[PDB]
Design a protein around this ligand. Structure first.
Ligand SMILES: Nc1nc2ncc(COP(=O)(O)OP(=O)(O)O)nc2c(=O)[nH]1
Length: 158
């Protein structure tokens, strides 16, 4: 199954974390990275907060069940990032979000797939569009269309 995972890091120098996360993702059992988008520097979704994020999208081939994949992404979040105390927006330094899991729709207490807000987030959509420009969401929405319509600022590469 191809899962699309968004990586966000709000570290000032996120490359090493992102690389650790990518390695970690590549190490998830039953999985392997198909493609990694470029790394993009994106303005934080919250206030300015300050920290730009590095955002990237990863296409991960996996035979894992989505909740099993989520276990691994959450593990990697815990292992490779930490919590920003008191931060309401982006408390984690490293977010790994399953954006899409194959063509599955998942609406469980643990997991909302497609990612519950990705259609509002250029920082998720543009990297994904880089690696999956033709992507069609389970409901038939098209990634390209969402971008076309919402006119999300293009992202600068990190
Ligand atoms: N530019 C940018 N801004 C961001 N703001 C918040 C989060 C994650 O915020 P969080 O409080 O964890 O909430 P959620 O992941 O549920 O949207 N991620 C980004 C990101 O990846 N890129």
């Amino acid at each position: 199954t191809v899962a699309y995972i968004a990586i966000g890091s709000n570290l000032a120098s996120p490359l090493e974390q992102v690389n650790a996360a990518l390695k970690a993702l590549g190490d998830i059992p039953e999985s392997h990275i198909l493609t990694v988008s470029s790394f993009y520097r994106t303005p934080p979704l919250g206030p300015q907060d300050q920290p730009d994020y590095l955002n990237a999208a990863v296409a991960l081939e996996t035979s894992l069940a989505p909740e099993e994949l989520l276990n691994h992404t959450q593990r990697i979040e815990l292992q490779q990032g930490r919590v920003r105390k008191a931060e309401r927006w982006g408390p984690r330094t490293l977010d790994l979000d399953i954006m899409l899991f194959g063509n599955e729709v998942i609406n469980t207490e643990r997991l909302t797939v497609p990612h519950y807000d990705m259609k509002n987030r250029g920082f998720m959509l543009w990297p994904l569009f880089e690696i999956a420009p033709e992507l069609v969401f389970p409901d038939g929405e098209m990634l390209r269309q969402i971008l076309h319509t919402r006119a999300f600022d293009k992202l600068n590469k990190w």
